[PDB]
Amino acid sequence: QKYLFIDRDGTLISEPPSDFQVDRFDKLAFEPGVIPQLLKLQKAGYKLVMITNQDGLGTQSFPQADFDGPHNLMMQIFTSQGVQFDEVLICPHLPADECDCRKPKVKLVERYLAEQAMDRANSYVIGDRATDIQLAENMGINGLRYDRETLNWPMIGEQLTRR
Amino acid sequence: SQKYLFIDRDGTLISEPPSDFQVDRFDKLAFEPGVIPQLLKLQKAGYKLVMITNQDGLGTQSFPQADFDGPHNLMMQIFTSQGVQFDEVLICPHLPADECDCRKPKVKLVERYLMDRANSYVIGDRATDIQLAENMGINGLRYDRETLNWPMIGEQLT
Numbered sequence: 001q002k003y004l005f006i007d008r009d010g011t012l013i014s015e016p017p018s019d020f021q022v023d024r025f026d027k028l029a030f031e032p033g034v035i036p037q038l039l040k041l042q043k044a045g046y047k048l049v050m051i052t053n054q055d056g057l058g059t060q061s062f063p064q065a066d067f068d069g070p071h072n073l074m075m076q077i078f079t080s081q082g083v084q085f086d087e088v089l090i091c092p093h094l095p096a097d098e099c100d101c102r103k104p105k106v107k108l109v110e111r112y113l114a115e116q117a118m119d120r121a122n123s124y125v126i127g128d129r130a131t132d133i134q135l136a137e138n139m140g141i142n143g144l145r146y147d148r149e150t151l152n153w154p155m156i157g158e159q160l161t162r163r
Numbered sequence: 164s165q166k167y168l169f170i171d172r173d174g175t176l177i178s179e180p181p182s183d184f185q186v187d188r189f190d191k192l193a194f195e196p197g198v199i200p201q202l203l204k205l206q207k208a209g210y211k212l213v214m215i216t217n218q219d220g221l222g223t224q225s226f227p228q229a230d231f232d233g234p235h236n237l238m239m240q241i242f243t244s245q246g247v248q249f250d251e252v253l254i255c256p257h258l259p260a261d262e263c264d265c266r267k268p269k270v271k272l273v274e275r276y277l278m279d280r281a282n283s284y285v286i287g288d289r290a291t292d293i294q295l296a297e298n299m300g301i302n303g304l305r306y307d308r309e310t311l312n313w314p315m316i317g318e319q320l321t
């Protein structure tokens with residue numbers, strides 16, 4: 001079973017440069033081609049897992065309800081279009097917290113690291129940061145660095161369905 | 164000449180809010196199932212897309228433009244980022260009691276198009292969308308999420 005463990009901010013949707021929080025609907029913007037390309041990936045046999053660091057989500061620096069609105073709408077869009085994430089894995093912690101679950105730590109994905117849980121050879125972490133790539137290393141799998149110009153959703157869709 | 168799909172907004176591309184028929188809040192925005200992949204499938208088959216919508220009283224105290232713009236611009240962001248392009252977005256903002264020239268099924272918003280008539284369509288969920296197709300001299304598909312939906316239409320037209 002091949003899995004794509006996919007980052008949220010800066011990968012599925014744009015990352016706001018001011019505070020790095022999609023905490024209003026006008027800061028919500030899908031990355032180009034993400035929907036058709038995730039559809040294409042699913043049709044090739046990949047299951048999808050969302051994995052995101054959301055610094056201080058739940059607290060007053062990032063109120064749950066400020067996150068929920070655009071997140072839920074993002075999820076309705078995916079679901080309604082046929083894109084299904086098996087899980088959405090979120091670390092709401094601050095880096096100072098030194099929590100167990102903050103990417104590139106593997107705690108959130110521990111069940112996929114069980115011994116026949118996935119096909120490590122053909123599974124990927126897709127994300128736009130070094131920490132996504134480090135997560136992949138920590139997981140014993142491939143890391144793809146999403147880039148809107150140089151490794152984008154159409155390129156990814158093509159590359160991962162190559163035979 | 165050119166194949167067009169004249170596509171209704173509320174109830175056809177996006178969900179129609181059941182109590183007040185206005186998508187005037189972000190939390191009332193939802194996409195109709197499969198609308199994105201099917202419109203992309205339709206584009207690849209040579210259909211050009213035009214959005215056509217009655218937005219009763221858009222700009223009045225009951226439907227302020229700023230209330231419309233937010234969810235609408237977001238919907239547009241989503242479509243465009245995913246490769247779906249509407250050549251135009253044609254809006255009648257009037258109340259029915261105004262009896263304007265532009266409220267579907269009247270043909271005014273679309274005069275300019277009045278294209279390959281035999282392969283062109285109005286797609287919408289109301290009898291008024293079907294009447295628009297008749298008034299325009301083209302085909303009408305009565306969208307229904309359950310019974311004549313986006314995957315069916317994508318398949319039918321390709």
Ligand SMILES: [Ca+2]
Nearest residue numbers: 007009010128
């Ligand atoms: Ca990111």
Ligand SMILES: [Ca+2]
Nearest residue numbers: 171173174288
């Ligand atoms: Ca309608």
Ligand SMILES: [Cl-]
Nearest residue numbers: 007052053103
């Ligand atoms: Cl992250």
Ligand SMILES: [Cl-]
Nearest residue numbers: 171216217267
């Ligand atoms: Cl209408």
Ligand SMILES: [Zn+2]
Nearest residue numbers: 091093099101
């Ligand atoms: Zn954590």
Ligand SMILES: [Zn+2]
Nearest residue numbers: 255257263265
């Ligand atoms: Zn009008």
